Amino acid sequence: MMQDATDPAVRAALQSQPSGLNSTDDWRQVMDRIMSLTARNPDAFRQQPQANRLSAILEAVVPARANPTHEKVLAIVNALAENRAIRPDEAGLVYDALLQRVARYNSGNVQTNLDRLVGDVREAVAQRERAQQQGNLGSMVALNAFLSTQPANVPRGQEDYTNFVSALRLMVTETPQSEVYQSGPDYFFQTSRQGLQTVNLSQAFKNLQGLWGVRAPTGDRATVSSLLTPNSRLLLLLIAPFTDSGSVSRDTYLGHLLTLYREAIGQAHVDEHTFQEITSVSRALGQEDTGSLEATLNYLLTN
Amino acid sequence: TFEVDPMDEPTLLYVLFEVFDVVRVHRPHRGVIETVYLRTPFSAGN
């Protein structure tokens, strides 16, 4: 089990308010401790020195108003650090700039809002932290711009593309984390990893609009399908762990190559379980076994 | 009821009473200091 982002209203409380005994806030906890009612040891208040004994009585029986503002205003500014509304080095300015703002306006209806906004801003950290795990929000809106600009449902050659419409939508829903459909240049493009080692254009996909339905030769790479760019080829291998059945595997490469993209993944996860064993058995071989990779090469070439 | 060995030159008998004077350095605002001192066994504090 794991925690959510360390509670932003509590992190700032951790650094300000008393830890052990706040005699006013934890009143019936000190009162329980002084009445010899605590289950740990009853006479923990009796065996204590007489002077600090009296300090517990004066503070608990007469509750003293402790300063609450600096654990409320800091609760906003540290949430401003976790929601990233300010930079971490900005904690010197905004903490006091708003304290100087409430120095001028201590006593309007604004601070009655402020503590209600404290509960709102602390929840906004918890809302966004669960929302950044699903980076769908900066992805689906971007795909809405892709679906509108690109002409949808126009394969007047042959139609297998209706299945492909949902295939791109499945990539948004299944993996959301680093999967951002960034619109930097006017061509749309999707990143798969946190460092973006396969971020091809979804407008390199515009090469497929004339190749949505053509004739198939035989079983070896086609006499025509050499036109398919390694840019668009990178996309079609990336949608392959998402959609398989739907596109016709016998009419054009939209389906025949998509089934063949599963052959690339099908070998990969087998060889993953192959490599994790031969590398693990290095005590009995005592060599840099590149034959683990050479057999992997042999299991792809000699078929 | 002090008593010393025979006096010749005019001298001040320096007597210290063990009193207790402590501070606390407050900072509610950055730049603004709130000052409070306390010598208790000498009717001083706050």
Swiss-Prot record, chain A:
Where on the tree of life does the source sit, at the highest rank? Viruses
Positions of region (Binding to hexon-linking protein): 138-251
Question: What's this protein's name?
Answer: Pre-hexon-linking protein IIIa
Q: Which residues lie in Polar residues bias regions?
A: 14-24
The protein's location, in the record's own words, is: Virion; Host nucleus
Q: Which residues carry this modification: Phosphoserine?
A: S225
Report the family membership: Belongs to the adenoviridae hexon-linking protein IIIa family.
Q: Which residues carry this modification: Phosphothreonine?
A: T274
Keywords from the UniProt entry: Capsid decoration protein, Capsid protein, Host nucleus, Late protein, Phosphoprotein, Viral genome packaging, Viral release from host cell, Virion
Q: Where is this region: Disordered?
A: 1-24
Induction section of the entry: Expressed in the late phase of the viral replicative cycle.
**Could you say which residues of the full protein are shown?**
1 to 303 of 585
Q: Tell me where the transmembrane regions lie.
A: none
Curated annotation (Swiss-Prot), chain B:
Localization in the cell: Virion; Host nucleus
> What drives induction of this protein's expression?
Expressed in the late phase of the viral replicative cycle.
In the record, Phosphotyrosine modifications are located at Y37
Protein family according to the UniProt entry: Belongs to the adenoviridae hexon protein family.
Q: What else is known?
A: All late proteins expressed from the major late promoter are produced by alternative splicing and alternative polyadenylation of the same gene giving rise to non-overlapping ORFs. A leader sequence is present in the N-terminus of all these mRNAs and is recognized by the viral shutoff protein to provide expression although conventional translation via ribosome scanning from the cap has been shut off in the host cell.
State what this protein does: Major capsid protein that self-associates to form 240 hexon trimers, each in the shape of a hexagon, building most of the pseudo T=25 capsid. Assembled into trimeric units with the help of the chaperone shutoff protein. Transported by pre-protein VI to the nucleus where it associates with other structural proteins to form an empty capsid. Might be involved, through its interaction with host dyneins, in the intracellular microtubule-dependent transport of incoming viral capsid to the nucleus.
The record's subunit annotation is:
Homotrimer. Interacts with the capsid vertex protein; this interaction binds the peripentonal hexons to the neighboring penton base. Interacts with the hexon-linking protein; this interaction tethers the hexons surrounding the penton to those situated in the central plate of the facet. Interacts with the hexon-interlacing protein; this interaction lashes the hexons together. Interacts with host dyneins DYNC1LI1 and DYNC1I2; this interaction might be involved in intracellular microtubule-dependent transport of incoming viral capsid.
What name goes with this protein? Hexon protein
Organism, scientific name: Human adenovirus C serotype 5
Gene (name only): L3
Which residues of the complete protein does this chain represent?
904 to 949 of 952
